[PDB]
Design a protein around this ligand. Sequence first.
Ligand code: NA
Ligand SMILES: [Zn+2]
Ligand SMILES: [Zn+2]
Ligand SMILES: [Zn+2]
Ligand SMILES: [Zn+2]
Lengths: 259, 259
Amino acid sequence: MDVTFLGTGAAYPSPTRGASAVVLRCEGECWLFDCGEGTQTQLMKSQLKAGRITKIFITHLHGDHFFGLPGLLCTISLQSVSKQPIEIYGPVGLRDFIWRTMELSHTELVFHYVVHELVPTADQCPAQGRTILLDSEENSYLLFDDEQFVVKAFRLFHRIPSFGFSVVEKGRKICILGDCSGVVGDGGVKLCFEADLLIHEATLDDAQMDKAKEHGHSTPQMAATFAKLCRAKRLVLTHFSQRQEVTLAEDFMVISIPI
Amino acid sequence: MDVTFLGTGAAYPSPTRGASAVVLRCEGECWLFDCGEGTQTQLMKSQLKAGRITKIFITHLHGDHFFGLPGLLCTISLQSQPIEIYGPVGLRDFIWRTMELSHTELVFHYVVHELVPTADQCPAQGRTILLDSEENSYLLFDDEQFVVKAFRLFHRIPSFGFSVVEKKVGRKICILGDCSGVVGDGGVKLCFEADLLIHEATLDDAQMDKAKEHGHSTPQMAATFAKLCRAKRLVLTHFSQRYQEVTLAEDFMVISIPI
Ligand code: NA
Ligand SMILES: [Zn+2]
Ligand SMILES: [Zn+2]
Ligand SMILES: [Zn+2]
Ligand SMILES: [Zn+2]
């Protein structure tokens, strides 16, 4: 079980840090978390293969987290019956984006996909596919629960609504948070408790905390405080402004979680 | 006056050849022809600056020619006259909806002028630009410095070539989208004695049948068109990915056009 960082930069892809994308691998099955522009080329450079991706999870509808998605699907198709659809989980709006973009570009994908949309709430920002609704008691979204994994989402605060994802082996726990300046109620501490790996943004340095919060971002001290509060075993910082063990992510870094 | 190749590959971007994008530069003013995924990052790696781009021309709505556009506009905005965008019907709504979905407020104004294709181009505020039946071309603009026109190509979906004429008469640069041929005589006439002619050669001549099946050309097809137009120099691009003067385009190649 490992995470491969494809893009570790904030706001846009650069020559030194790609736009947001991380792949979680379990037993040859790949799950992609975020898909900024250039993700498909970062995949090509990596040891991973786009064709092995079975699920995709989008944290929020800022372009550095999803503009690479149409390209990625097209290329997977161009290079390919798959039996099971690729499952795509993300905020409301994502399903129509993909459908329209594929139609506009006259792309007939050779595989089936389904988009499951998470419904955000207005307090996340300043004042056949499923629709997935918050459970107010649990304070989370159930994405899926099978024999191997339970995967859930929780609400973050950002300039637009943003989500974190919790992956639990039925075992190891990996939590991956979208851009944020905070978490809505106890959703994070609950789901992220004793995470084996916690992936958190740290867009700006601690001296720029005011600017960070302004833009719905975090600094390393904010991430670290959340990690300590959740008793995470490992904290990995990512989504750096372009130019408990704590690791600063770089593109193509692979972190394994031993059993 | 120079031409800079940003991406020279076919169908998708790779680590060795980016998706379609070429920049024409005159006296510090940059015009971009096509905008595949990764174009913004190629620009960063190049000696060019995204912020100097004043016009963008899209040959056809295949993703390897436009999926990079939303990202490019966002990054130009983040890092900074209106930008003029020319391309097929459908492009304007694509850009508008994508900006809205991603909650992007661009700091510059842009306008999208749409070219209306004809049905025989494929197998059986902003302007809406019609084919002129007398001239068999589309007038994009005509000022004291330049006359720029589009003409119809045959591809799997409708595709366009662009003719740029400097007034002295002066230099003529013609850049053709993906195609297996030109539709009627509008194109041969506009490309006559081109100083530089940029043409695809997706597959080698031994795969001509496969090339034509996919609305593509081989080097002999491109060469024959260059000879027919009496072009001075032919540059081949849009090469299949590793999965009369004739020059083979590579990413970051710069060709200077003397007066
Ligand atoms: Na790879
Ligand atoms: Zn971001
Ligand atoms: Zn964001
Ligand atoms: Zn193409
Ligand atoms: Zn094409």
